[PDB]
Design a protein around this ligand. Structure first.
Ligand code: CLA
Ligand code: CLA
Ligand code: CLA
Ligand code: CLA
Ligand code: CLA
Ligand code: CLA
Ligand code: CLA
Ligand code: CLA
Ligand SMILES: CCCCCCCCCCCCCCCC(=O)OC[C@H](COP(=O)(O)OC[C@@H](O)CO)OC(=O)CCCCCCCCCCCCCCC
Ligand SMILES: CC1=C(C/C=C(\C)CCC[C@H](C)CCC[C@H](C)CCCC(C)C)C(=O)c2ccccc2C1=O
Ligand code: SF4
Lengths: 41, 88, 165, 159, 41, 98, 73, 740
């Protein structure tokens, strides 16, 4: 993009990025942490 | 575990027939409390898609008659089992 | 006229506050007959208000931008200007009584400790010795100074319970 | 003849339960023993199919009826169903996580049904058995969500 | 009298006598004299 | 166990500790026989916990990415619709910024 | 930031856009402050005044600053 | 069998035990070595169980303790009557109750307090009272201050008699244990005698005294020319014109012609439109029927003449198969434990005080009480809080009985033992219903707050949006409104105007108007049910786990009020039942605070107000149906829309309420030291202060010690409760005085 070439933001960037980091990222964090704390030995 | 718990005996279903004979056709106000209940369930069946409203008198007769019934079957069960066990 | 505070005798907001208080006090006066006892109480309240406003003025008191009198706390400034009556003389006035209570409590503690089971004396007070010490505590700073020099006031820490850190 | 209805389980006053008519009723015992989660001889995936079907059929209802788009006609019945499917997927993920967590070890002590006769091991109490159970749960939940969806399309009454 | 005045000498009564004395003293000072602010004699 | 008063024997400690399945039966294949293999083949590709955790995550991240990008603005969610004309000015005590 | 540079006393700073799917239709409209189109949040951190004071004018320079600080992180 | 067993002169009357303050406890009889001796002295002062193990001396002690409390209450009542006789405007208030605010406390002009002598009208200045004593003195026919003086002097005489009675019945003639154990005689004498005789005496006083005075008062006759009640009592001619049935002269009573008494023993539903209170004829027939019901119920038990009922037989005969032994030993417990009877009596007293508050807010039984919004609000809130306190104390003393007086010998398979047996099931089910009620009440509130905040009011739980209509309460309202039509045909109108169709108003202000119930009332009522279920969970868990628990099996041997069993098992802090009561006090405080907030908001928004020609305008804008569904709506439209008069009360008659408000804020905030903190830090700080006092030789002989952990918790809960109660008291009274 013009004058915004580092880390170019599309118009659908918030509408796509917000649900992964509020939905998918906490889910992966929860599952990874739950497998961590429940790991035996 | 002695599956006779809450003993299902048809003798205590007879006491459920005395209350429609006692409350019903016993004059008092109007015709009877059970008679008024019969009239109420009669007119309530006309509006099948809907139900009784807040201003309707059906709930009063229904609740009073049903607590009277529950009281009489509870007391009949208690008496008829205290007779058998020795509790009187 | 220090720190930008006008004297209370020549302050417009002080007189406006006095007029406002007289107005609301006289507002309640119209609801009672003049020969009634609430009228006499309201009249006495108004007289006490007027006497307080008069006595607060012409006494060196000053105020600034609020109509409420201010107090000068710095010694010297309250001595060169006539403001020692605000806090300078009440300072020694309180300290005399504060040292009075501390001295009579100390003498009662010392007198009770040289007695069998002294813990009972704290919950079972004795009247003649406490009242004698109460009336023998006017010269508290004179007793405090003489005990300070000779070690009877203080105690060396070799008989004082100290923390084990 | 006192009719001591309230008694401890197996005549044992030392453990948690006491045999009570909420528990000792033949109708309640027969209904609970015939529930899929207590059919020990049946494979855990066949357990999960019925359990997920029932739970995914029930979970669609509140989402359609009280969803944010409930006032929009025609679209509430699809939004509620896909949100129910997402909830079923979340519950399947948590079920798989529980299967990983609770069956990393091996149980050594049996269940001991009344008057003895215990089977070797419940396949539900195993790792791969609970994984199959969660697989049956998510398949049943998805099929139940789709069934509640098509029941909201063809209808003689309401939704 | 001795048996009663021993009870009279305990702390709750002393908790009143000092309280009554000091309270009444301050009431009479605030009553006969008006409300002052400055100790200018 | 439970002869006249005893509740412990140390050789059938499965009965001693109180481990009892109050509701447990061992009746196998209660559903009809043709019904199992339709669902047994349904589970076998997702029976492994690795296949199931991946599939839930596969339907998870894809549908989450579908929402907002394609999921929003088709349901007319009130986040990607835009304003008409509201809230340009702010400040009731004056100053009137923006 | 450009609108703040043109008029600091009038235009308000903006921190980040608000994409909350649980927002209602009045909620989206009532948060387009600072002369924006979408729902945005008014910045009170003071970085607008600081960056206008140190000579940052265009958002290209802020983009270069962001990528440089990400590189140094 | 029942007789009067009395021991004469067991205790000498002397100040020997007054000389030594620590004499009831052998641990405190040594001396005050530490500063905790004083707190143990004032704490174990009335704990008569550890003073001695003899039940007879404990019974004598509590008998004279009740005598002393009765004398104290009689002194207080005599003082209130004297205040109404001397410093009051009761004569002015009688001639004008709708325009002159009641006042019975007169302050001194000593230091600026003359602003507190508010202009209450009638040429009188003083503190505007809120107890409603003027309404009571108008119901019970009282005209002049001479009668109030006589009542005050009689109350002082009876208080002196009660104190002398306590001294006599302890020091001079103390009853034995068998005298106190005559439970059947006690019940018969306090059913037929106390309650029945008092009800009959009050009915007679209302019929012969209060009815003519109240009949002449609402007719416009000035009280100066109203005849004194002794003229009505002696002369049948004066009482005959006001009530024609008195011309018969007790003929219909003995000839069974009670229908002729339908003029002054009426059965009317509603309130008197002239005054706003209940009809005095209705109250006369009410108290007469209550006297009848208590005279017949007071002859039930068997004491000395064969006939009657034996309570042990009644308890042991009611045995049902799911309960095993049915009420088998409870007669033995309740005849030997003072704390069990204390728990029962305190629980029933607290619940009945709650009923008293609800049924005074519902039907005002006093003339010019409904329009006096301050008296009604104060009575409701005060009896609300007293009932809550009595219930919490009932739980506390039940736990004390559990710890001390409970023994396993008499109870094997009875109801108490089986309640002990399945206590975990009860606690778990109560926790489940606790979580369920908490979620679908408070989460509903939070969801409504969120949908309001998200700009979606159509997704809220309100009347405009999807609603939770309280159909059962509205059906009960409709049934009670239509109850005089069919089920009670002899009633003139509905028993209360909560569910009526008409609005009564005295002096241009609404006395009582019909109350509409919506989604907000549903939410607040289920919030109340949740909060009460939590508090009863805490109290019942404290009672049940006081003896033993899975954590601490030997909690019985550790006493009732102990701080902890140490940091073992992860820390067993607050494990005692005393700490359970300590938490239940706060939960009570939250419950009753929300209850009285609901009462004040609902009554100010839908009942209280000033009637106009063009409809009825309430105190608020009728915003309870629109703002009580959200927490922010509750806050802004109740605690912020009101309390604007408390902050601006300065310089006015109600500035003392603002001072009390801020002092209550201080005490409520000061309590959190004793709540959050512990003892070791405070003990070390006290050690440093002790070193400071040791340096210059002012060391006290009594060692200064920090407060005990139970002592610190008690101080914290006491300061917290006092601050919260005074906060709500000041806010409620200032709002209802400056507006109502
Ligand atoms: C560590 C500081 C930080 C914080 C608190 C935020 C906070 C936020 N960002 Mg930002 N972001 C950051 C750094 C940060 N960002 C960096 C360094 C980049 C450049 C890679 C981005 C790129 C970015 C984009 C492209 C978007 C957000 C969005 C968001 C919002 C939703 C959260 C989200 O989608 O995660 C951010 C998601 C990422 C993938 C960035 C992770 C970068 C890692 C740490 C490297 C939220 C206001 C979204 C939004 O709605 O805007 C308001 C959005 O569309 N951010
Ligand atoms: C630590 C406490 C304290 C403080 C902050 C002050 C502060 C002040 N004093 Mg003060 N003073 C104090 C204690 C204190 N005093 C005590 C204990 C006494 C003895 C009673 C005095 C006696 C005193 C006198 C006699 C005078 C002051 C004056 C002053 C002012 C000017 C200071 C100065 O050196 O000129 C500024 C110098 C810069 C180089 C200043 C407001 C003077 C004043 O009022 O100014 C007009 C003045 O004449 N003071
Ligand atoms: C008369 C006895 C007496 C004396 C001489 C002292 C002296 C002292 N105390 Mg102590 N104190 C006392 C009683 C006394 N205290 C009592 C009864 C309490 C409990 C309330 C305390 C609580 C206390 C604390 C918590 C602290 C001190 C501190 C101090 C020091 C600061 C001076 C001061 O005013 O403290 C302020 C003192 C108080 C606020 C306590 C006021 C209580 C009243 C006035 C005492 C009543 C005593 C009684 C009238 C005597 C009986 C008279 C006799 C004829 C019967 C000083 C060493 C401070 C310190 O360590 O400084 C280094 C400190 O932190 N004291
Ligand atoms: C610690 C702070 C503090 C201070 C310095 C004062 C000091 C004062 N206040 Mg305040 N006051 C306080 C706390 C305080 N009070 C608190 C906590 C309350 C709430 C209970 C009040 C409530 C209050 C009221 C309502 C009034 C005062 C008044 C007064 C004055 C009366 C002094 C007196 O008794 O005559 C002097 C006493 C003596 C000289 C004693 C003599 C002892 C021997 C014989 C010497 C004085 C200026 C009155 C006043 O004058 O207004 C300005 C007034 O109207 N105050
Ligand atoms: C969208 C998700 C999804 C995916 C990726 C698959 C994919 C698969 N399933 Mg499956 N299935 C699905 C949904 C899905 N199915 C649903 C909703 C049902 C109804 C409950 C089934 C019921 C089902 C059965 C009963 C069987 C399969 C089988 C299969 C395999 C062959 C395809 C076939 O015959 O379809 C159908 C393949 C691995 C078969 C298989 O693996 O055979 C070895 C098999 O036995 N599936
Ligand atoms: C019909 C007879 C009668 C009456 C009226 C009462 C009345 C009362 N009893 Mg009871 N009592 C009775 C018989 C009676 N008793 C018998 C037979 C026994 C033995 C089994 C007891 C044993 C007993 C105990 C153990 C206790 C009471 C208590 C009380 C008081 C409870 C306080 C209350 O509720 O507020 C009502 C308050 C009032 C009405 C205030 C007026 C009080 C007047 C002066 C009492 C007059 C009633 C009296 C019986 C008259 C004869 C006494 C005579 C020697 C002077 C109340 C006054 C409690 C107590 O100690 O209080 C005294 C208590 O704990 N009672
Ligand atoms: C029918 C009424 C009644 C009776 C006869 C008793 C009798 C008893 N209770 Mg119970 N109790 C009651 C009501 C009653 N209580 C209520 C309503 C509560 C709830 C608050 C409690 C809570 C309670 C607990 C938690 C405990 C008792 C205990 C006791 C015993 C000793 C009490 C004692 O020595 O206090 C001594 C008296 C005091 C400490 C004075 C009270 C001062 C309070 C804390 C502050 C009052 C402030 C006041 C309201 C406003 C003043 C403001 C201030 C600025 C001046 C005794 C068996 C204790 C026990 O060991 O039982 C065997 C015990 O642990 N009770
Ligand atoms: C207002 C203050 C407050 C609140 C909210 C709580 C909350 C709680 N206390 Mg407590 N309590 C407090 C102060 C408070 N406490 C204080 C000061 C004391 C000291 C006296 C106590 C004493 C006390 C005792 C003695 C007991 C409790 C219990 C409870 C629980 C009751 C749960 C319930 O039924 O409600 C429902 C739940 C709530 C109200 C919590 C908020 C729920 C909101 C609406 C969120 C809804 C779901 C949400 C969307 C999920 C978020 C997901 C996110 C992670 C992504 C809960 C954990 C009791 C308990 O353990 O449960 C039986 C209990 O026995 N508390
Ligand atoms: C909500 C709480 C439900 C509690 C259910 C159990 C009650 C406790 C219980 O089991 O009580 C048992 C009781 C019958 O037992 P019995 O008749 O043998 O006991 C009666 C004697 O205690 C007298 O049944 C009921 O109370 C039925 C109504 C329950 C509601
Ligand atoms: C502050 C505090 C203390 C310290 C408090 C103590 C030692 C009590 C102090 C009581 C005082 C001495 C009562 C008297 C108060 C004033 C002296 C009264 C003044 C009256 C005027 C007229 C002078 C504890 O000991 C404690 C223990 C456990 C939990 C929390 C706490 C806690 O929070
Ligand atoms: S912090 Fe206090 S109450 Fe808790 S275990 Fe320790 S000593 Fe006991």
């Amino acid at each position: 993009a013009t004058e915004g070439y580092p880390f170019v933001p599309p118009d659908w960037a918030p509408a796509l990025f917000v649900p992964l980091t509020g939905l998918v990222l906490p889910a992966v964090g929860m599952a990874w942490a739950f497998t961590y704390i429940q790991k035996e030995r | 575990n002695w599956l006779r718990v809450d003993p299902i005996v048809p003798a205590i279903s007879f006491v459920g027939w005395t209350l429609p004979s006692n409350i019903g056709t016993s004059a008092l106000n109007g015709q009877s409390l059970f008679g008024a209940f019969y009239e109420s369930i009669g007119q309530n069946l006309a509006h099948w898609p809907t139900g009784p409203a807040l201003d309707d008198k059906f709930w009063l007769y229904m609740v009073t008659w049903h607590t009277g019934l529950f009281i009489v079957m509870l007391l009949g069960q208690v008496g008829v089992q205290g007779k058998k066990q020795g509790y009187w | 006229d220090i720190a930008g505070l006008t004297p209370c005798s020549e302050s417009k907001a002080y007189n406006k506050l006095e007029r406002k208080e007289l107005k609301v006090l006289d507002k309640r006066l119209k609801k009672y007959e003049p020969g009634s006892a609430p009228y006499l109480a309201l009249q006495a309240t108004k007289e006490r208000t007027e006497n307080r406003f008069k006595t607060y003025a012409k006494q060196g008191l000053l105020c600034g931008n609020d109509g409420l009198p201010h107090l000068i706390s710095d010694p010297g400034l309250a001595l060169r200007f006539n403001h020692a009556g605000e806090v300078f003389i009440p300072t020694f006035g309180f300290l005399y009584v504060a040292g009075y209570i501390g001295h009579v409590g100390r003498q009662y503690i010392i007198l009770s400790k040289e007695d069998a089971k002294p813990t009972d004396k704290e919950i079972i007070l004795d009247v003649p010795l406490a009242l004698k010490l109460a009336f023998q505590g006017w010269a508290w700073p004179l007793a405090s100074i003489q005990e300070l020099r000779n070690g009877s006031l203080l105690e060396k820490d070799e008989n004082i319970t100290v923390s084990p850190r | 003849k006192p009719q001591q209805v309230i008694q401890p389980i197996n005549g044992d006053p030392f453990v948690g339960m006491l045999e009570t008519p909420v528990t000792s009723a033949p109708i309640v015992a027969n209904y609970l023993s015939n529930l899929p989660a207590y059919r020990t001889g049946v494979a855990p995936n066949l357990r999960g199919v019925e359990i997920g079907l029932a739970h995914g059929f029930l979970l669609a209802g509140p989402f359609i009826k009280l969803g944010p788009l409930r006032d929009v006609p025609g679209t509430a019945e699809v939004v509620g169903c896909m949100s129910a499917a997402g909830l079923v997927l979340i519950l399947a993920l948590c079920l798989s996580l529980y299967g990983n967590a609770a069956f990393q070890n091996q149980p050594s002590m049996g269940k001991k049904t009344l008057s003895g006769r215990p089977l070797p091991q419940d396949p539900l109490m195993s790792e791969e058995g609970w994984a199959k159970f969660a697989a049956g749960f998510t398949v049943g939940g998805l099929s139940g969500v789709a069934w509640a969806y098509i029941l909201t399309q063809i209808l003689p009454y309401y939704s | 009298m001795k048996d009663f005045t021993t009870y009279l000498s305990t702390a709750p009564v002393v908790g009143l006598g000092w309280a009554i004395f000091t309270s009444g003293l301050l009431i009479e000072i605030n009553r006969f004299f008006p409300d002052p602010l400055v100790f200018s004699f | 166990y439970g002869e006249q008063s005893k509740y412990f024997d140390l050789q059938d400690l499965e009965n001693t500790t109180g481990a009892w399945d109050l509701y447990g039966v061992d009746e196998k294949k209660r559903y009809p026989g043709l019904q199992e293999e339709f669902f047994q083949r349904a589970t076998d590709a997702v029976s492994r916990r690795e296949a199931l955790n991946g599939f839930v995550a596969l339907t998870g991240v894809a549908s989450i990415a579908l929402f907002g990008l394609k999921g929003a603005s088709t349901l007319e969610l009130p986040i990607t619709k835009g304003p008409r004309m509201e809230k340009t000015e702010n400040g009731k005590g004056g100053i009137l910024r923006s | 930031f450009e609108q703040w540079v043109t008029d600091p006393i009038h235009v308000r700073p903006i921190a980040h856009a608000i994409w909350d799917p649980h927002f209602g239709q009045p909620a989206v409209e009532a948060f387009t402050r600072g002369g924006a189109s979408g729902p945005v949040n008014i910045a009170t951190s003071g970085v607008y005044q600081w960056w206008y004071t140190i000579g940052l004018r265009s958002n290209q320079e802020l983009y270069v600053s962001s990528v440089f600080l990400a590189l140094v992180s | 069998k029942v007789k009067i067993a009395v021991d004469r002169n067991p205790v000498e009357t002397n100040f020997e035990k007054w000389a030594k303050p620590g004499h009831f406890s052998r641990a405190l009889a040594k001396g005050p070595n530490t500063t905790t001796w004083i707190w143990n002295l004032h704490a174990d002062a009335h704990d008569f169980d550890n003073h001695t193990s003899d039940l007879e001396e404990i019974s004598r002690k509590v008998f004279s303790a009740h005598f002393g409390q009765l004398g104290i209450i009689l002194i207080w009542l005599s003082g209130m009557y004297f205040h109404g006789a001397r410093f009051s405007n009761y004569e002015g208030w009688l001639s004008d109750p709708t325009h002159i605010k009641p006042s019975a406390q007169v302050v001194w002009p000593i230091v600026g307090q003359e602003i507190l002598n508010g202009d209450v009208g009638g040429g009188f200045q003083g503190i505007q009272i809120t107890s409603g004593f003027f309404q009571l003195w108008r119901a019970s026919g009282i005209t002049s201050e001479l009668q109030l003086y006589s009542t005050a002097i009689g109350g002082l005489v009876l208080a002196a008699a009660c104190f002398f009675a306590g001294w006599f019945h302890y020091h001079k003639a103390a009853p034995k244990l068998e005298w106190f154990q005559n439970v059947e005689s006690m019940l018969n004498h306090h059913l037929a005698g106390l309650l029945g005789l008092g009800s009959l005496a009050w009915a007679g006083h209302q019929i012969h005294v209060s009815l003519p005075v109240n009949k002449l008062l609402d007719a416009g006759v000035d009280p100066k020319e109203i005849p004194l009640p002794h003229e009505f009592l002696l002369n049948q001619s004066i009482i005959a014109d006001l009530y024609p049935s008195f011309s018969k002269g007790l003929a219909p009573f003995f000839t069974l012609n009670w229908a002729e008494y339908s003029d002054f023993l009426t059965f009317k539903g509603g309130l008197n439109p002239v005054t706003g209170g209940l009809w005095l004829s209705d109250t006369a027939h009410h108290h007469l029927a209550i006297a009848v019901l208590f005279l017949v119920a007071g002859h039930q038990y068997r004491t000395n003449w064969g006939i009657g009922h034996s309570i042990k037989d009644i308890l042991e005969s009611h045995k049902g198969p799911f309960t095993g032994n049915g009420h088998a030993g409870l007669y033995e417990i309740l005849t030997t434990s003072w704390h069990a009877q204390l728990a029962i009596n305190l629980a029933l007293f607290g619940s009945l005080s709650i009923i008293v508050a609800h049924h005074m807010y519902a039907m005002p039984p006093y003339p010019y009480l409904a329009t006096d919004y301050g008296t009604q609000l104060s009575l409701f809130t005060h009896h609300m809080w007293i009932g809550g306190f009595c219930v919490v104390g009932a739980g506390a003393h039940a736990a004390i009985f559990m710890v001390r007086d409970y023994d396993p010998t008499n109870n094997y398979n009875n109801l108490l033992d089986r309640v002990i047996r399945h206590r975990d099931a009860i606690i778990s089910h109560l926790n489940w219903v606790s979580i369920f009620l908490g979620f679908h009440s408070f989460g509903l509130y939070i969801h409504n707050d969120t949908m309001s905040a998200l700009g979606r009011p159509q997704d809220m739980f309100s009347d405009t949006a999807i609603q939770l209509q309280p159909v059962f309460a509205q059906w009960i309202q409709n049934t009670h409104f239509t109850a005089p039509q069919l089920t009670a045909p002899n009633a003139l109108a509905a028993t209360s105007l909560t569910w009526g169709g008409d609005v009564v108003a005295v002096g241009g202000k609404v006395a009582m108007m019909p109350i509409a119930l919506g989604t907000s009332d549903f939410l607040v009522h289920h919030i109340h049910a949740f909060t009460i279920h939590v508090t009863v969970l805490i109290l019942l868990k404290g009672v049940l786990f006081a003896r033993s628990s899975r954590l601490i099996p030997d909690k019985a041997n550790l006493g009732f009020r102990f701080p902890c069993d140490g940091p073992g098992r992860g820390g067993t802090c607050q494990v005692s039942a005393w700490d359970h009561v300590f938490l239940g006090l706060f939960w009570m405080y939250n419950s009753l605070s929300i209850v009285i907030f609901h009462f004040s908001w609902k009554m100010q928004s839908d009942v209280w107000g000033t009637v106009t020609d063009s409809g009825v305008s309430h105190i608020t804008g009728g915003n309870f149906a629109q703002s009580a569904n959200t927490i922010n709506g509750w806050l802004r439209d109740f605690l912020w829309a009101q309390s604007s008069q408390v902050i601006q009360s300065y310089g006015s008659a109600l500035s003392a309420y603002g001072l009390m408000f801020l002092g209550a804020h201080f005490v409520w905030a000061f309590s959190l030291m004793f709540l959050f903190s512990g003892r070791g830090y405070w003990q070390e700080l006290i050690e440093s202060i002790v070193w400071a006092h040791n340096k210059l030789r002012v060391a006290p002989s009594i060692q200064p010690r920090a407060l005990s952990i139970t002592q610190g918790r008690a101080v914290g809960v006491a300061h917290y409760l006092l601050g919260g109660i005074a906060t709500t008291w000041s806010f409620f009274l200032a709002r209802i005085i400056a507006v109502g």
